[PDB]
């Protein structure tokens, strides 16, 4: 209901999604919910930076109308088209004809696709140029891939705000807006969890246009994403963050997804275990048919290492671990060391399958033929899984 | 607790398992629990057929001392070495150390890697050697493959009594422990679930070691499995079931299984159903991520066609579809027709890995280059999927 004033003129008037546990679909899971951010900025020509997911167009108008009786908006700007942000188009532009469409190219191609019928002025707008509303402007800075195609940031010059759409965004479910009312780590836990699923297999896309906002000396006081808390206290705190992940040197930490039938490769997997930790080395031990392949995806981010294992079943791999394989070939994680294990009664295969999708996820296998075992671990072959883990711990170093 | 005699010196002395709900690890889904079935024959010297899950070998060992206290124990009969058949078998071998084990090659061989450390009188068993016991005898039939290895079935002439270990069996707890003391309809669902998920893939062996058995003119009055219900009052229904489902010709069914992020891929999935259903075919619609793929699979036993579609994310399959098609793979589907669908948004590449898989799974696909739209359908493009789904309910004709 109650829109939420950014700074005098400025204000959040998007709408929280609270019961939602599934967003794009049946992919990243939202324990705590989400937001669907869009900022409006009030001045001689006012602009509504984004919109909302249709099923929310409610709330939003309701917040616009909370701010000025019949709703101006002179501008309508779309970083971002996905649907989360631009469901209520529609119903906005019904609501404001003339509104004036500021995007990229393939932001309105995107656009014409996903809505079509629906007739507005527009004006392809390119990474460095600038409109006015009076007191206040609104240059915009292309970011293709940076999650899509048609994304884009929007930059308020004259208050140094940062709207980036997705980026810098969690996916958290709150009455609160501002990161200093929310826990430092919790929030940032939420924001790691966030890239590790997203932005993950644009890191080097990342860094760059970080670097780029750097050498323009882009004075960045305050960062809205369109999903979760803004980040007003301290946004050099998330900046920061996303240069680290997006470098992806990592941490001495080892993440081990597995699953198992009988218990022999979950053996196997304490004693990599046990040998990982013993090179001093950190490790997080996910049995796949109980854990969330999002929060596994999540702690990857900063492991150097990522060891799979599955038992074989008719000559192939157990399906549970088949999601977290194939997530991890597109997102394909910047530099890791991994392996793969498993047992098999006689003719064995999951290995293979194993080692090829870890191949192409470009995880660099500390020792091709990983330990397989046939029926029951031995005492050589525990040992074996130790010293095995004792060598990536080594490898990890740090 | 008590035993239950099948008849005169014949008892059921297993446990049924309430609370499981996941087999075989995280692999077979059993909404219902199971039991693991043992029986006892007591003649002139009483053997024991199989034993119990090691979690519930004090149930075993209670329910035999309830035949006869110092328990004897000639032979002991491995149909099976799996685990919830052979867990118990260091304990039963603790309990009688004389006896004398009867078994496969295969089976002995597992059994000495799964167990060592425990030596026993045994001697290994192939089809048509036979056993007495006084009254009754028993004599064994190699069963290869037929689910595993070392499989076999025991069959006991006198009583024309089956113990064919996990064949013929269906995941299912009961108080009860015949066929004619539970419902016909759900008991041979079950039976089916369990077929379509473990048996699938040696379709062709079940027949010929049904043609096998029919050869020697066997007479089977009664089939005991090693998990669910006792074929008791009617072996005939469920051999016919197997003997169908082995020859693999199916009905005109087709089962459509996808996922999808903004519902155009689901879409494609309704077009293709409505085509198909105007072909007069039967349709089953799975949205992955909220099925059961245990079920799934069950449907697929009778489908002629088997159709799975998803959007593209990071140039890969979403990971929800991925468990179907690689437990696809493994199971080896005989005489199916497919197809593949989905949407993308600007490269693509789901596409590839659906008709990839679904070839390697055995699966015909109606059309290699299956339906495929960029963003949202339009009206030719479901008009398309209509057609496609016309055109296999045409081919699926019946
Ligand atoms: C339904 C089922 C199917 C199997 N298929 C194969 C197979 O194709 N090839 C193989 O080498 N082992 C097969 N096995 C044996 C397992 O690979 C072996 O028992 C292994 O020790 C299980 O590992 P786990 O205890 O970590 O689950 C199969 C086992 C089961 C229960
Ligand atoms: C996280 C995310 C990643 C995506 N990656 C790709 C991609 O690599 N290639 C592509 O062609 N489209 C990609 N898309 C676009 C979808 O394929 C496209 O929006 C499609 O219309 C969604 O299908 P659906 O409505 O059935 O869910 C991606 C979309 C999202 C949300
Ligand atoms: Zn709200
Ligand atoms: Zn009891
Ligand atoms: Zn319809």
């Not at 809505?115 to 292309?142: A, C, M, P, Q």
């Not at 004693?271 to 996910?286: I, P, R, W, Y």
Request: charged share 25%; aromatic share 10%; glycine share 6%.
């Amino acid at each position: 209901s109650q829109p939420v004033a950014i700074t005098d003129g400025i204000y959040w008037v998007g709408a929280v999604d609270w019961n939602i546990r599934y967003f794009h679909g049946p992919a990243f899971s939202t324990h705590r919910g989400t937001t669907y951010n869009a900022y409006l900025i009030v001045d001689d020509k006012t602009a509504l930076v984004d919109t909302v997911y249709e099923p929310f167009k409610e709330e939003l108008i309701a917040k616009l109308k909370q701010i000025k009786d019949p709703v101006k908006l002179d501008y309508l700007v779309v970083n971002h088209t996905e649907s989360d942000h631009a469901g209520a188009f529609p119903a906005i532009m019904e609501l404001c004809p003339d509104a004036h469409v500021l995007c990229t190219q393939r932001a309105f191609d995107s656009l014409k696709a996903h809505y079509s019928h629906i007739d507005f002025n527009y004006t392809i707008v390119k990474t460095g140029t600038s409109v006015s509303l009076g007191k206040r402007s609104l240059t915009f800075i292309e970011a293709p891939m940076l999650h899509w195609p048609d994304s884009m940031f929007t930059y308020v010059p004259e208050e140094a705000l940062l709207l980036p759409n997705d980026a810098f965004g969690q996916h958290i479910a709150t009455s609160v807006r501002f990161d200093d009312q929310v826990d430092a780590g919790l929030i940032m836990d939420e924001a790691a969890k966030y890239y590790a699923n997203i932005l993950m297999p644009f890191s080097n896309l990342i860094t760059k246009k970080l670097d780029e906002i750097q050498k323009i000396n882009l004075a960045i006081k305050t960062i809205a994403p369109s999903h979760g808390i803004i980040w007003r206290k301290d946004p050099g705190r998330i900046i920061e963050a996303y240069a680290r992940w997006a470098e992806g040197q990592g941490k001495a930490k080892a993440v081990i997804a597995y699953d198992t039938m009988w218990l022999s490769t979950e053996k196997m997997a304490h004693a990599l275990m046990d040998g990982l930790v013993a090179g001093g080395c950190e490790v997080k031990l996910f049995k796949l048919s109980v854990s969330d392949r999002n929060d596994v995806i999540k702690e990857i981010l900063d492991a150097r290492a990522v060891l799979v294992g599955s038992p074989t079943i008719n000559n192939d791999i157990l399906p549970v671990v088949s999601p977290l394989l194939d997530d991890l070939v597109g997102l394909r994680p910047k530099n890791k060391v991994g392996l793969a294990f498993g047992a098999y009664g006689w003719g064995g295969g999951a290995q293979k399958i194993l080692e090829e999708r870890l191949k192409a996820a470009k995880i660099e296998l500390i020792a091709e033929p990983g330990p397989t075992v046939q029926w029951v671990p031995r005492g050589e072959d525990l040992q074996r899984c130790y010293e095995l883990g004792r060598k990536i711990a080594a490898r990890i170093a740090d």
